[PDB]
Ligand binder design. Structure first.
Ligand code: ATP
Ligand code: MG
Length: 503
């Protein structure tokens, strides 16, 4: 009855020699082998000063060794803290100072620089490279495989993941053993994962999607995964003939749609395509079904909440919607201010509650308090509505709402109109200060190479479909939209870039 995620996963292992992970080089690792690797690394953590509750901060390229470090940290009663591989030394200083890890694991090439930061909190530094080699690996080579998995309670911490930083400086979400186990166990059943599943895993593992959703679901299900270092369209297509599931972000799908190899035949062996982490556009959903005959299953989650909602595996998968609340999870829509729940169909603030919901922000009890309602619901900061069937629809982030001339203007329906115009790839509608209207609705648009469509053409096209107060005051064409490492459009960046256009 140990609640320790590692114990939930592996204490009882009925089929130990079954495949768990195939590496990018084609090496194969069984469940028993994975467990033994984690035992060695857990012993290394203790030998390097880990005490129960200590954080282990890890910035490494993706590898099975890096995944093992996650498992071992949890197993040893530590708190795993993955960090975006792109963070610079200076950025890392903030996270290391905030979290005060006892151990920091980094790429061999950064050891000297990171050691300086680590010394500020007295952390021990080990290394792990893209090839799975380094001081961590040397230490594990002589360590014992046997390790008594540490007793942990449901609410004890297993991890701290920093948010993606879309709306400001990343905050450290404190995730418990039960947060992670309850969510992944629910998903195994809800998505019907079985030991026969083979998951193509091409996502980063410093983010909740690639780290927890991909790994924990597979591992609980006793299925396996195939690692790829990053999104590679041709390698992903190659693997579909011998895999059953792909978890991706919308950019995976729009990029795969550009391959002439993406056909019914090429995807015919696959069971399920899942999309998450950013909005899957309804047009993208329809394009995928038109080209491949598969209905993409989209789900919605956050760093702070793990997965909240999902389109059903055995029900209607609705373009533009993220599905009803998962089993065990409650979702509602409230008046953003007052907090009163709204009638089904009304747009407002999405709030969630459940065993998936985190314990708060690391050493930010005040900001934690402001993000929870009195009755324990968490304010997502996402605006949307819940339809008559209980499907949640996300309209945008609260900060993406544009208030202009006294009106609430929701950008997505404008973007949908612009996207539908011939010559348009995609568009982002934002608001920036305007002296006459409060904010000026501004359309930032990516067009096809050689497309003729221009500003006047775009505004005229909208004129006959859109209320006057919703009309963009100008259209700005760009080579591409700014996106973070997980493929999300950064409207924060756009608002900053164009803040002065109406000055
Ligand atoms: N399927 C989806 N459809 C629409 N939006 C989504 C979906 N999945 C995730 N999102 C958006 O991503 C957010 C979760 O992102 P994440 O936890 O990676 O950090 P972030 O919110 O982007 O960064 P920060 O919290 O630092 O501002 C959600 O709150 C939601 O706005
Ligand atoms: Mg957020």
């Amino acid at each position: 009855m140990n609640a320790n995620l590692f114990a939930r996963l592996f204490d009882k292992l009925d089929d130990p020699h079954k495949l768990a992970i195939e590496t990018a080089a084609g090496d194969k690792i069984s469940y028993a082998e994975l467990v033994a690797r984690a035992g060695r690394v857990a012993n290394v953590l203790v030998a390097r000063g880990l005490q129960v509750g200590d954080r282990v901060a890890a910035q490494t390229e993706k590898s099975v060794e890096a995944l093992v470090l996650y498992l071992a940290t949890v197993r040893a009663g530590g708190v795993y803290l993955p960090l975006n591989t792109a963070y610079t030394l200076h950025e890392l200083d903030y996270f290391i100072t905030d979290a005060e890890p006892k151990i920091v694991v980094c790429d061999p090439s950064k050891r000297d620089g990171i050691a300086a930061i680590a010394a500020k909190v007295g952390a021990t530094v080990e290394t792990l490279g893209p090839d799975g080699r380094g001081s961590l690996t040397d230490a594990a080579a002589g360590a014992s495989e046997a390790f008594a998995t540490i007793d942990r309670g449901a609410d004890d911490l297993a991890a701290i993941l920093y948010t993606s930083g879309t709306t400001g400086r990343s905050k450290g979400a404190m995730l418990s053993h039960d947060n992670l186990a309850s969510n992944s166990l629910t998903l195994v059943d809800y998505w019907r994962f079985t030991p026969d599943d083979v998951l193509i895993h091409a996502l980063p593992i410093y983010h909740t999607h690639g780290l927890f959703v991909a790994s924990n679901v597979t591992l609980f299900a006793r299925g396996s995964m195939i690692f790829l270092p990053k999104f590679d369209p041709d390698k992903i297509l190659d693997l579909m003939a011998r895999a059953t599931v792909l978890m991706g972000v919308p950019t995976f799908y729009t990029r795969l749609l550009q391959s002439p190899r993406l056909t019914k035949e090429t995807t015919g062996h696959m069971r399920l395509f899942i999309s998450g982490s950013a909005p899957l556009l309804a047009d993208t959903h329809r394009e995928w079904s038109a080209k491949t005959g598969h209905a993409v299953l989209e789900r919605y989650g956050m760093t702070e909440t793990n997965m909240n909602t999902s389109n059903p595996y055995d029900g209607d998968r609705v373009p533009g919607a993220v599905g009803p609340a998962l089993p065990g999870v409650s979702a509602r829509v409230t008046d953003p201010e007052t907090g009163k729940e709204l009638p089904r169909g009304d747009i407002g603030m999405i709030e969630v509650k459940g065993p998936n919901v985190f314990k708060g922000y690391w050493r930010m009890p005040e900001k934690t308090k402001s993000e929870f309602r009195d009755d324990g619901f968490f304010i997502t900061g996402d605006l949307g509505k819940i339809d008559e069937r209980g499907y949640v629809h996300i309209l945008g982030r609260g900060k993406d709402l544009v208030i202009t001339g006294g009106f609430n203007v929701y950008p997505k329906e404008i973007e949908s109109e612009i996207d539908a115009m011939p010559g348009v790839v995609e568009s982002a509608v934002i608001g920036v200060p305007h002296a006459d209207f409060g904010e000026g609705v501004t359309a930032v648009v990516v067009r096809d190479k050689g497309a003729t469509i221009d500003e006047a053409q775009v505004l005229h096209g909208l004129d006959g479909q859109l209320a006057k107060f919703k009309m963009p005051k100008k259209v700005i064409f760009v080579d591409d939209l700014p996106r973070n490492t997980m493929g999300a459009v950064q409207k924060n960046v756009l608002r900053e870039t164009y803040k002065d256009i109406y000055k």
